[PDB]
Structure 1
Amino acid sequence: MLRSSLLPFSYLYEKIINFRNTLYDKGFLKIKKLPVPVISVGNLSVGGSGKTSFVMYLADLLKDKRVCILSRGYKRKSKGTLIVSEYGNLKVSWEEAGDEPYLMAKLLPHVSVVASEDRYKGGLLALEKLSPEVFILDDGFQHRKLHRDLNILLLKKKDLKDRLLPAGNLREPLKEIRRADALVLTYQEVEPFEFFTGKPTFKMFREFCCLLNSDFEEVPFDILKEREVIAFSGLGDNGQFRKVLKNLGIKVKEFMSFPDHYDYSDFTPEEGEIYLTTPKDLIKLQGYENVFALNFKVKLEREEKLKKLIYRIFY
């Protein structure tokens, strides 16, 4: 009675997406090649992805290499190509980087981050200024103009039952799973599933580790014992965030929901209280030393097989 009113747009959208993908499939559009290895991390749908967690996990597997993330930076205060971070050191504000590349940079203290709609051009600037040994595309599955040596696709169980935008959340039809070199089957900790394609496949679990402080440093969740917290969220994470806090058994004396565009210009915390919020909110509250986010770690099955795939792209 409403969502079905969106299906006409979905059928149209499918024609457009399929046509573009056919052009790349058949060599009608140029695929550019950077002179160092490129690993893409991506998914098929809008919505919670685990992509951010996986990028952090992957960058850690490559801790022995000079790594640069090539991020889109969809909405920024600056355009073109922008070095957001030089091996952990932020060079711009979130306002200028966009919330996404800035958050990624804060979550990766030894890695460079470059924001550029055109990932190839971002790669060239990085090669010139940062001399990376490997690039990771965060959210790069659809960016077919840039060759990747290892195309990693994250899939959650919900994706397999979903539909193309705007009727559903899929950015591309499920047949495009064929482009993946490796599949990562996500959210196993709450919606476990199997999916056989013949491709190298890795189940991903995320498990609660500890807290992130406002300097984005890891700290024990011990600090929460015998303390009630005030929790808050700067968007619809209201539902999600509240659930996670409950399932973890964290005692929340109060919850506050803010506008999703909130830049926390008017945020006024109380001395002596402890606050919990999301990492996306936390980036706007650095320096408030009584404000924390939850930190989860990726646990991946057959990790050594993934390490082997990664190793082989350096030849």
Structure 2
Amino acid sequence: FSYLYEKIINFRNTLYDKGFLKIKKLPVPVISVGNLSVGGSGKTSFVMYLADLLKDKRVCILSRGYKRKSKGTLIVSEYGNLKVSWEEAGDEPYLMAKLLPHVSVVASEDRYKGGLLALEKLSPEVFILDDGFQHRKLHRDLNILLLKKKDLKDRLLPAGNLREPLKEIRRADALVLTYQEVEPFEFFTGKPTFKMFREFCCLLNSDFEEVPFDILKEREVIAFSGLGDNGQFRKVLKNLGIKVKEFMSFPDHYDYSDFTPEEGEIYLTTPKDLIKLQGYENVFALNFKVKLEREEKLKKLIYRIFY
């Protein structure tokens, strides 16, 4: 079937290419972050990295809200003020909202509408589209595309993980090449291109406070995650030399409703999972900083949108 999903996608894109479908424009600058495949690609992390670059602007992130308990357009946080449970928001928007005390977050299937409500209520100076590469109906002033090595040899859904053919790389203004710290790769296209690394430096307790890895020594952990790809987390742990006695691989966006930790055991998971387990005392998350090659170049490129 990957050949008529593909027909549909190609058709859709041609329509947008030729100007047969409406592209709408918000009255402030819009940066899109997205990728080409299902299965995680550093999008959420990159969006948080980006919001941080723009710390001197009023920033609003526009997200779709992936499997949440709420409908329509929803304000998740107002410049840091959380306003819904993580269930109501979707885990990614909530995580962003939580780790970015200075940013607003809006969840909306129709991103343009989300932007309008945000303008009305938050007067942001810049929008970041969380996962907005395929949402061509909303105009973006800077279209950033994340690629991981794996995408390069993947194929269209349902056969493979690609939501669109690799040729659609042409729609990007800038490419970000992710997971360099675990799957390095090069990719030259003549477009502005930036390698993204994750520096795994820190450990969080379940109240989102930094703690030394000191608790991990000469202790084997039970690790788990519910991510786009649990495999890369599992590998990061091995590369870090963290002793992992067991690994539980949960579905992306897993709700942990039936999760009950065993007494005396220590659990290691990600911030994306941890938001759903706040207060469980023996559960920790591996945390990291995002670092971009040629950050200075990315900045000049980003600030062009304000002129």
Same fold (TM over 0.5): yes
Instruction: Note the C-alpha offset of 1:148.
Output: 0.5
The one-character-per-residue Cα deviations of 1:84-121 (angstroms, maximum 9, x if unpaired) are 11122211112211223222322322211110010010
Q: Distance in 1 between matches of 2:245 and 2:157?
A: 39
Partner of residue 205, structure 1: 197
Instruction: Note the C-alpha offset of 1:228.
Output: 4.1
Aligned pair in 2 of structure 1 residues 259, 206: CA closer, same or farther (>3 Å)? closer
Correspondence 1:297 to 2:289: yes
Is the CA contact 2:40–2:228 (under 8 Å) kept in the aligned structure 1? no
Give the secondary structure class of the aligned counterpart of 2:55.
Answer: coil
Give the one of 149, 152, 171 matched to 1:179.
Answer: 171
Instruction: Note the C-alpha offset of 1:74.
Output: 3.1
Which stretch of the first structure deviates more once superposed, 223-232 or 105-114? Answer: 223-232
Which stretch of the first structure deviates more once superposed, 276-285 or 24-33? Answer: 276-285
Is the CA contact 1:107–1:216 (under 8 Å) kept in the aligned structure 2? no
Is the CA contact 1:106–1:216 (under 8 Å) kept in the aligned structure 2? no
Q: Distance in 2 between matches of 1:260 and 1:183?
A: 25
Instruction: Note the C-alpha offset of 1:71.
Output: 0.4
Aligned pair in 2 of structure 1 residues 175, 234: CA closer, same or farther (>3 Å)? closer
Give the secondary structure class of the aligned counterpart of 1:11.
Answer: coil
Partner of residue 219, structure 1: 211
Which stretch of the first structure deviates more once superposed, 248-257 or 116-125? Answer: 248-257
Give RMSD over aligned pairs.
Answer: 2.2
Instruction: Note the C-alpha offset of 1:213.
Output: 2.7
Q: Distance in 2 between matches of 1:256 and 1:191?
A: 22
Instruction: Note the C-alpha offset of 1:72.
Output: 0.5
**TM-score, normalised on structure 2?**
0.91
Which stretch of the first structure deviates more once superposed, 204-213 or 177-186? Answer: 204-213
Give the secondary structure class of the aligned counterpart of 1:10.
Answer: coil
Instruction: Note the C-alpha offset of 1:24.
Output: 1.0
Instruction: Note the C-alpha offset of 1:164.
Output: 1.0
Q: Distance in 1 between matches of 2:240 and 2:15?
A: 47
Partner of residue 105, structure 1: 97
Runs of at least 5 residues in structure 1 that lack an aligned partner in the other structure: 1-8
Q: Distance in 2 between matches of 1:203 and 1:70?
A: 24
Is the CA contact 1:74–1:117 (under 8 Å) kept in the aligned structure 2? no
Instruction: Note the C-alpha offset of 1:259.
Output: 7.0
The one-character-per-residue Cα deviations of 1:244-293 (angstroms, maximum 9, x if unpaired) are 32221223355455677753344444677542123232111112243211
Aligned pair in 2 of structure 1 residues 248, 85: CA closer, same or farther (>3 Å)? same
Runs of at least 5 residues in structure 2 that lack an aligned partner in the other structure: none
Aligned pair in 2 of structure 1 residues 65, 223: CA closer, same or farther (>3 Å)? farther
Q: Distance in 2 between matches of 1:52 and 1:261?
A: 13
Is the CA contact 2:182–2:232 (under 8 Å) kept in the aligned structure 1? no
Instruction: Note the C-alpha offset of 1:239.
Output: 4.6
Aligned pair in 2 of structure 1 residues 266, 156: CA closer, same or farther (>3 Å)? closer
Aligned pair in 2 of structure 1 residues 65, 298: CA closer, same or farther (>3 Å)? same
Aligned pair in 2 of structure 1 residues 45, 255: CA closer, same or farther (>3 Å)? closer
Instruction: Note the C-alpha offset of 1:238.
Output: 5.8
**TM-score, normalised on structure 1?**
0.89
Show the 5 A alignment for 1:233-312.
233-234=225-226, 239-256=231-248, 263-269=255-261, 274-312=266-304
Is the CA contact 2:40–2:229 (under 8 Å) kept in the aligned structure 1? no
- Identity fraction in percent: 100
Instruction: Note the C-alpha offset of 1:158.
Output: 1.5
Aligned pair in 2 of structure 1 residues 24, 261: CA closer, same or farther (>3 Å)? closer
Q: Distance in 2 between matches of 1:115 and 1:105?
A: 11
Give the secondary structure class of the aligned counterpart of 2:203.
Answer: strand
Is the CA contact 1:69–1:114 (under 8 Å) kept in the aligned structure 2? yes
Aligned pair in 2 of structure 1 residues 160, 254: CA closer, same or farther (>3 Å)? closer
Is the CA contact 2:41–2:148 (under 8 Å) kept in the aligned structure 1? yes
Instruction: Note the C-alpha offset of 1:23.
Output: 1.1
Give the secondary structure class of the aligned counterpart of 1:299.
Answer: strand
Q: Distance in 2 between matches of 1:292 and 1:29?
A: 47
